[PDB]
Amino acid sequence: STRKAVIGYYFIPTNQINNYTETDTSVVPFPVSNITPAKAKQLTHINFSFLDINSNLECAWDPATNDAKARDVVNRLTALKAHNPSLRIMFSIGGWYYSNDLGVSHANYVNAVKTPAARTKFAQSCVRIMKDYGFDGVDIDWEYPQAAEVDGFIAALQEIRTLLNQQTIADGRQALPYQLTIAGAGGAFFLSRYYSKLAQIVAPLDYINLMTYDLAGPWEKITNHQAALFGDAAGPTFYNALREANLGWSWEELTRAFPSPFSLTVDAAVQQHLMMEGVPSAKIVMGVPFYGRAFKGVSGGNGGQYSSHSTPGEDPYPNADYWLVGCDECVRDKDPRIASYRQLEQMLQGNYGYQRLWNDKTKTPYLYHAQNGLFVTYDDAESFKYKAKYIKQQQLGGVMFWHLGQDNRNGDLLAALDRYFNAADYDDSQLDMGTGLRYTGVGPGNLPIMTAPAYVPGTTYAQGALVSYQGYVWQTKWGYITSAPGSDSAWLKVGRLA
Ligand SMILES: C#CCO[C@@H]1[C@@H](C)[C@H](OC(=O)NCCCCNC(=N)NC(=O)NC)[C@@H](C)C(=O)O[C@H](CC)[C@@](C)(O)[C@@H]2OC(C)(C)O[C@H]([C@@H]2C)[C@H](C)C[C@@]1(C)O
Ligand SMILES: C#CCO[C@@H]1[C@@H](C)[C@H](OC(=O)NCCCCNC(=N)NC(=O)NC)[C@@H](C)C(=O)O[C@H](CC)[C@@](C)(O)[C@@H]2OC(C)(C)O[C@H]([C@@H]2C)[C@H](C)C[C@@]1(C)O
Fold first, then answer.
1. Where in 245-313 does DSSP place strands (E)?
2. 405 is annotated as contributing to ligand binding
3. The CATH number fitting domain 290-379, selected from 3.90.580.10, 3.10.50.10, 1.25.40.20, 3.40.50.300
4. In angstroms, what is the span from residue 404 Cα to ligand 2's centroid?
5. Euclidean distance between CA atoms 154 and 180, whole angstroms
6. Which residues form the signal peptide?
7. Ligand 2 pocket member 218 (CB < 6 A)
8. After which residues is the chain broken (C to N over 2.5 A)?
């Protein structure tokens, strides 16, 4: 009955704000008017990226942003609401540049959540900003708080929530309540910084936006798909860092939740969230990329997949060699490692040597240039079907993507998602998800339905025996056990009843 969310990030730089225009694709490639009325129906939210946090621990614009020009750009967005019953113009604070451990503004994020006084100051400053420009909510895309600074981050979220609720009340917005989201890590290494406190992080949120992409890059030893749905046994595996999180669980409970090594996939990140108690599927949103990640130096043999590579990982890109054959955006934006789906469809469609291939295990596409040893991992309307099925099957809240300004001018990626959830003509029940590797981890938040003979006191239970008791199914870790299930360390809760 309820609609899957469709959360589209929207980026525009400070300099394109201050020289903003609707008619010069040289000064502004993707201006607001680019977003049709029919497109504005297709999105539930639009995250206007990015604001930041200045030395005073307040939410702010880039010091050299011009207010009037900044203001005009937002009303144009908020205007879109006329076309859509449900649209929210969120604003997003953070991004990688501002908030990474060695980003420009990093310390501000640390100090803004460090104390009650600061959290008060900062949270007020978020809402103050939200109303003062017409925004329908707040997104916090801090990549990422670390253990000591997670508690404060939590508190910050709680504070903002309360202030959003006060404002929802004040403006009589029960029809469309001011919302709070974050962009969350989509991979175990980064997710392990706050994993143990995930239920508290999610509680004050309408959604957690899983950045289930950028899971491969130049930093890796080996080329890999950046947003594989399921795992390919030919591909690389990784250490499950979540088995070392401060959870206080037993060896069995850890082993059962965190297989290691494992495949770094979308399914993996989602199940990892589901495994925690108090994290409802409905709040979990699957990110997907509207860009492609490009590698060079790939030895052939297997489509450029899982190969050693010569892609620099420095920031910024350290030279003037734009090797990504026939990507103008890469020249103008000065980085060949990232390309929009717009620019990718060109590259392929053109006369270029690129070969679009398909991995039937990961259900993702990838471009292979055999002449120049190039490999590109990305998503398209074809992979989006399998990701759309998963969202349904697993009963997630919907989809997020980065970003809208990297879809084409028609907007067929956006339209393809909207189709897979909504459009009544569309169907995907026969769609084969394949024999890709699933994350099989089980935790206390995603216990499978099971049955077993009822436990009987006085009975001696061997290693492995299963019984039913007080609503749950239990399993003996060793034998022979006579204690009541749950009363000592010999029992493992493996499933639930009825
Ligand atoms: C998203 C992102 C990463 O940040 C970019 C910037 C870092 C770009 O990175 C990029 O697009 N990488 C894609 C992978 C995504 C992994 N994180 C992620 N998906 N997060 C997420 O979904 N959050 C919701 C790069 C191409 C770039 O343009 O960087 C130039 C230098 C080449 C900057 C550093 O000068 C850059 O210039 C512009 C283009 C004007 O953008 C600003 C920034 C100052 C901006 C502050 C950062 C910015 C949005 O582009
Ligand atoms: C390569 C390399 C060495 O560089 C490292 C840094 C580059 C790490 O090095 C590395 O590749 N290690 C072997 C990888 C196997 C596991 N696989 C894996 N972790 N995959 C994964 O997380 N997918 C999303 C990389 C995994 C990393 O975490 O890079 C992130 C972006 C994904 C950075 C670029 O944001 C990174 O973030 C932190 C962790 C804060 O550190 C800095 C840097 C800003 C730092 C400059 C980079 C630095 C030292 O960790």
1. 284-289, 291-296
2. no
3. 3.10.50.10
4. 26
5. 13
6. 1-40
7. no
8. none
